[PDB]
């Protein structure tokens, strides 16, 4: 069954570019354990093949068998439904709220990073921090699998590695590529780092960077910084 992911190329026309949608599906496919290929597209210099496969030009897209699929959310839903046990793990979260935890962070970041009004900087940095804190509280809330298991010193605190438990799920595949952009960009252009006191978020990121599915699908930091340079530099 042939599976080829087409993804956004970076500044050299070849390496992985900044696209958290590309990276989400790359990670889903890696987690499924299916055999697949990844082909980068320089959208300024498209191949005759890519032009034929996807006239509409959407990116990312997926060639599966002879069918071309577009729309990241739909492509992911398709993959989860078609790549099924026993050959491939189900990657859907068990707890619905894992699928919404921290979904606001990226738009708070986008406002913060596009803002060029100095009087609103602190408001927008607050908005971002508040959204990150709500993610932190999700990551430290025990989930049903952890029911009544603890230690005297950390009662009512979750020990789990990722959003929905100790395995990576589709929820992590959506969130992590975006959280990665937020970190990289805000360090470079805002002097901002996530507070050390968000221990849940910190642990989450520590565990996520330790996983090739996330770590090996990340664009180079440089690609992410270049992608944001024009809109991030406007604030003086």
From Swiss-Prot:
S-glutathionyl cysteine carried by residues: 19
Entry-linked Pfam families: CLIC-like_N, GST_C_2
Residues recorded with modification Phosphoserine: 116, 151, 206
Record's catalysed reaction(s): L-dehydroascorbate + 2 glutathione = glutathione disulfide + L-ascorbate; chloride(in) = chloride(out); iodide(out) = iodide(in); thiocyanate(in) = thiocyanate(out)
Annotated ranges, domain GST C-terminal: 88-228
EC code: 1.8.-.-, 1.8.5.1
Outcome of substituting residue 19 to S: Loss of dimerization and of ion transport activity
Activity regulation text: The oxidoreductase activity is inhibited by rapamycin, amphotericin B and IAA-94. The channel conductance is regulated by pH and redox membrane potential. Inhibited by IAA-94.
Matches recorded under InterPro entries: CLIC, CLIC-1_C, CLIC_N, Glutathione-S-Trfase_C-like, Glutathione-S-Trfase_C_sf, Glutathione_S-Trfase, Thioredoxin-like_sf
Residues that hold glutathione according to the record: 19, 59, 72
Note: The protein seems to have very low affinity for glutathione, even though glutathione binding was observed in protein crystals.
Family classification: Belongs to the chloride channel CLIC family.
Protein name: Chloride intracellular channel protein 1
Organism name: Homo sapiens
Higher taxonomy: Eukaryota, Metazoa, Chordata, Craniata, Vertebrata
Gene of this entry: CLIC1
């Amino acid at each position: 069954p042939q599976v080829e992911l087409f993804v956004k190329a970076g500044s050299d026309g070849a390496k992985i570019g900044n696209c958290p949608f590309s990276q989400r599906l790359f990670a889903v496919l890696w987690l499924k354990g299916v055999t697949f290929n990844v082909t980068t597209v320089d959208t300024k210099r498209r191949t005759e093949t890519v032009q034929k496969l996807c006239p509409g030009g959407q990116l990312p897209f997926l060639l599966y068998g002879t069918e071309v699929h577009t729309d990241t959310n739909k492509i992911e839903e398709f993959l989860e439904a078609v790549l099924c046990p026993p050959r491939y793990p189900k990657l859907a979260a068990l707890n619905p709220e894992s699928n919404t935890a921290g979904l606001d962070i990226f738009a708070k970041f986008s406002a913060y990073i596009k803002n060029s009004n100095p009087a609103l900087n602190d408001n927008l940095e607050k908005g971002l921090l508040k959204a990150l804190k709500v993610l932190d509280n999700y990551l430290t809330s025990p989930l049903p699998e952890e029911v009544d298991e603890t230690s005297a010193e950390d009662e009512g605190v979750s020990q789990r590695k990722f959003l929905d438990g100790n395995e990576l799920t589709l929820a992590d595949c959506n969130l992590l590529p975006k959280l990665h952009i937020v970190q990289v960009v805000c360090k470079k252009y805002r002097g901002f780092t996530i507070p050390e006191a968000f221990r849940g978020v910190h642990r989450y990121l520590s565990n996520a960077y330790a996983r090739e599915e996330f770590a090996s699908t990340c664009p180079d930091d440089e690609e992410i910084e270049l992608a944001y340079e024009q809109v991030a530099k406007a604030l003086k």
